[PDB]
């Protein structure tokens, strides 16, 4: 199945007390493998997964230098943006950056991306063709004009399509147990009569990886259903993910429904049902 | 692998 490795960068200005806070994190699929937090003593790019530790010292010294560079660029920005948006030195603002690789089942290149945001909104992003820029507002225009002048896109392309993919499959090869595993949903159900008449079933699913997973209810004629309270997939914390989707039915007339779990980890898609 | 280029000031 497809894979990927992204890098998320967040920088928050703290007017009145020290340099902005810089927190960068690296993922491969749904697995974190590195991090950095200017508020840590370390002041080094740290590991967050077994395989990634195997990397040599030159690696970290290198990755650390880079990230700090990313951090420095963000700092400078934070200043610039206030400028572009006529905003006082008092307020706190936020700069975000995310870029990564997508590869196919054949570990080949699929798409690349590099997005930047300010105060929770899109500032400027590189299009799919790893060539064009999408300027959010009047401010971003200024940026995509200098970014075009300096042929930033070209540099990013070189990386996205080139380096990022190699190292991705490099990591996929070393984390061949983690990144390339595939846990399965330990599904289970729960009742919950809303007192007489109606009832609410809860179709659970815990301990699965990757997080991608669908669980839809159905019944007789056509499958589907609305009144289905589906909660966003959450991290179990141990590396797997939890999630469930509840729906509402009329006492008894209930044992005529069932949610269908779909997940690559499942050789055969499950269709759990109720049985009291 | 962090990007080694294509990163500049906005």
């Amino acid at each position: 199945g497809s894979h990927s490795m992204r890098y998320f960068f967040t920088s928050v200005s703290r007017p009145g007390r020290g340099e902005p806070r810089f927190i960068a994190v690296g993922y491969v699929d749904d697995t974190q493998f590195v991090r950095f937090d200017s508020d840590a003593a370390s002041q080094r790019m740290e590991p967050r997964a077994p395989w990634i530790e195997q990397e040599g010292p030159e690696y970290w010294d290198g990755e650390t230098r880079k990230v700090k560079a990313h951090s420095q660029t963000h700092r400078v920005d934070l200043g610039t943006l206030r400028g572009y948006y006529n905003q006082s030195e008092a307020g706190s603002h936020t700069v975000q950056r995310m870029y990564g690789c997508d590869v196919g089942s054949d570990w080949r290149f699929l798409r690349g991306y590099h997005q930047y945001a300010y105060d929770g909104k899109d500032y400027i992003a590189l299009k799919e063709d790893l060539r064009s820029w999408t300027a959010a507002d009047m401010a971003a225009q200024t940026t995509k004009h200098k970014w075009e002048a300096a042929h930033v896109a070209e540099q990013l392309r070189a990386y996205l399509e080139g380096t990022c993919v190699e190292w991705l499959r490099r990591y996929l090869e070393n984390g061949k147990e983690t990144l390339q595993r595939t846990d399965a949903p330990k599904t289970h159900m729960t009742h919950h009569a809303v007192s007489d008449h109606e009832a609410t079933l809860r179709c659970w699913a815990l301990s699965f990886y990757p997080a991608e997973i669908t669980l839809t209810w159905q019944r007789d004629g056509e499958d589907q259903t609305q009144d289905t309270e589906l909660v966003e997939t959450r991290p179990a914390g141990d590396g797997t993910f939890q999630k469930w989707a509840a729906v509402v039915v009329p006492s008894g007339q209930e044992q005529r429904y069932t949610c269908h779990v779909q997940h690559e980890g499942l050789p055969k898609p499950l269709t759990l049902r109720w049985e009291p | 692998e962090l990007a080694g280029i294509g990163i500049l000031t906005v």
């Epitope: 880079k66 400078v76 070189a158 | -």
Partner: T-cell receptor
Amino acid sequence: SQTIHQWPATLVQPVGSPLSLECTVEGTSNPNLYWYRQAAGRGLQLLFYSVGIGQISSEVPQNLSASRPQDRQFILSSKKLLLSDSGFYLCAWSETGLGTGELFFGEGSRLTVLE
Amino acid sequence: QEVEQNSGPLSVPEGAIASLNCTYSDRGSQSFFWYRQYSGKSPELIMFIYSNGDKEDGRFTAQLNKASQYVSLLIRDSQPSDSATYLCAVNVAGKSTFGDGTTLTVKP
């Protein structure tokens, strides 16, 4: 050099002597400053690297020191030079960030440590 | 090792083409350069490359092959003033790593 300056240009100093090298950059801001060194034959060696103001980072167990007292004032110094310290010290800068790479060098500074 | 130039000095007759090679070991390298240094003066950039292929500028042509971790430089119609040391550089680990350079001598 129309953006980077380095002095002194030539230094013939005696062993155990103190060293101070200054580098000035004009025409950019919050740039990446580096102290390379050219001894033995050719080939630059990275002695120091600064991501930003007052941020130094030795790249090898060394005897020299470096500081960046200001966005554009980079300095290299030694408590007391050792013959080993001889070499052609080069200061360079790359644009704030981590782009195409490409650093701009200065006049350079030749240091001959005599015994 | 890491950046490996071939030293020199090479001899090329005025007019001929000058080939220069460089090999980088760290596959993390993401941009490559060629600096020219004249005995005395400091290193002066001639070209940089960050995508497989050939990049032309005047009598200069860089050639990058990430697959071979190979970066070259050709100096078409070489002149005696091209004589110098050409330093190959590799932008990696948030910095530039240099080779010990390769001396060039264009016999007139």
